[PDB]
Amino acid sequence: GLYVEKVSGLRKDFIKGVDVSSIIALEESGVAFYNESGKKQDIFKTLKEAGVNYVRVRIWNDPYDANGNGYGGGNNDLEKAIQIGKRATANGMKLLADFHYSDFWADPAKQKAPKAWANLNFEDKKTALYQYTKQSLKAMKAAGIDIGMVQVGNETNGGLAGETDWAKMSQLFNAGSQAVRETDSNILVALHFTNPETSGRYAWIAETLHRHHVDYDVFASSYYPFWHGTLKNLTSVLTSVADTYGKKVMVAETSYTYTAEDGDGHGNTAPKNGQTLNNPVTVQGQANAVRDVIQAVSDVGEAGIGVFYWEPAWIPVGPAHRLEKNKALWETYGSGWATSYAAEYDPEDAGKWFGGSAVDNQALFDFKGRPLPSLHVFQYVDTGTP
Numbered sequence: 001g002l003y004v005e006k007v008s009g010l011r012k013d014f015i016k017g018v019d020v021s022s023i024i025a026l027e028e029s030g031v032a033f034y035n036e037s038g039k040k041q042d043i044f045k046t047l048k049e050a051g052v053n054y055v056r057v058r059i060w061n062d063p064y065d066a067n068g069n070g071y072g073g074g075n076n077d078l079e080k081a082i083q084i085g086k087r088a089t090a091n092g093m094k095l096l097a098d099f100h101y102s103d104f105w106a107d108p109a110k111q112k113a114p115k116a117w118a119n120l121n122f123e124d125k126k127t128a129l130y131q132y133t134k135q136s137l138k139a140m141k142a143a144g145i146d147i148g149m150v151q152v153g154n155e156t157n158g159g160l161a162g163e164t165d166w167a168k169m170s171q172l173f174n175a176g177s178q179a180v181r182e183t184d185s186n187i188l189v190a191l192h193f194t195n196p197e198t199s200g201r202y203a204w205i206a207e208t209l210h211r212h213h214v215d216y217d218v219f220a221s222s223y224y225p226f227w228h229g230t231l232k233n234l235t236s237v238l239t240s241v242a243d244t245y246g247k248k249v250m251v252a253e254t255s256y257t258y259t260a261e262d263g264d265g266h267g268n269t270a271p272k273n274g275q276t277l278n279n280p281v282t283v284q285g286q287a288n289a290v291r292d293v294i295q296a297v298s299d300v301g302e303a304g305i306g307v308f309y310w311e312p313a314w315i316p317v318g319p320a321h322r323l324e325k326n327k328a329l330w331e332t333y334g335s336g337w338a339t340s341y342a343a344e345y346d347p348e349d350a351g352k353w354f355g356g357s358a359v360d361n362q363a364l365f366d367f368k369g370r371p372l373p374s375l376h377v378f379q380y381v382d383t384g385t386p
């Protein structure tokens, strides 16, 4: 019963990706996924059959405390990145390695240096960052992973690896980029920023990147309709960067709520009072949103290479009523967004908010691992629904 109006002018090699970084922690938590038919099956194979052709994976340097207690959020480190890559490549999907260059969540307010770089002079940190990237890529290559793109930083709107000075950030961006270039010329180098509604931000950032000679190919943007303004604006600011700097552009993160119900007992990110919700909070609504962002990026023209849906499967480890038994899993396997063990690294945020999934209601699978009809959006954008 799912409807999807054909996206206009959609290039056929358009990147249709998903970031399922939490898949490992979730699977270790006993969560399982199925397919249309209803039979237990590797999520990566279901994704492939759904038309997905790219997988994004976040990577934290050392997402653990001194004792080896994962910080949660999927406890995404190089090792899991390799497990995800191997499976992604095994299912004919390229990989986007997302380096946060931090031990935990890296966003507009958090860009903490990895503990190992905690007190290194800038010069040594810069070479550390390059070394890490270099070795991490090399490890992936050895595992036979098909790396199509690398993200040097995640939503680095105001910082990267403990640095906030753009001159230093650019040098770090370049250090990271350098490692990619030395690894494989075909790998696209992407920089990721967010909050495209902010007047002039992207224009200012692209110029700064220019002024400091940052070597990158993709100007990536996050896009959550409930905070990031209009689709008209997204297309506009991205088209400006593409045209002005000759960069490719894409949406590295996007999603939408298919239900207002919190499935595991941990307050969800959306929907909330005040957020913009142009599409109904339903499966069709979610599909409309995904299809619209794809349209928006495609409207950039030749430079709009794709859209990655962020966490389409961060479903509940258990029902909302087992809240306490759920916490046990979130804590043991880090299958929640954060564990109490991350209080050290991130005292203010993770410290007082740790728990489970904050986006289970934004997945493309139901709380039981069964795909929602909206998962069909990746295929239907090319043709439309009969």
Ligand SMILES: OC[C@H]1O[C@@H](O[C@@H]2[C@H](O)[C@@H](O)[C@H](O[C@@H]3[C@H](O)[C@@H](O)[C@H](O)O[C@@H]3CO)O[C@@H]2CO)[C@H](O)[C@@H](O)[C@H]1O
Residues within 6 Å of the ligand: 105, 106, 107, 266, 267, 268, 269, 337, 349, 353, 358, 359
């Ligand atoms: O759970 C109910 C409350 O959640 C709060 O959100 C918390 C953090 O404030 C928020 O930053 C964090 O988000 C994670 C990460 O930091 C972010 O960069 C990434 O994009 O998403 C992660 C989770 O998906 O999530 C926790 C717990 O939700 C809200 O701020 C609060 O209003 C309320 O909803």
Ligand SMILES: [Ca+2]
Residues within 6 Å of the ligand: 262, 263, 264, 265, 266, 267, 268, 356, 357, 358, 359, 360, 361
């Ligand atoms: Ca939840």
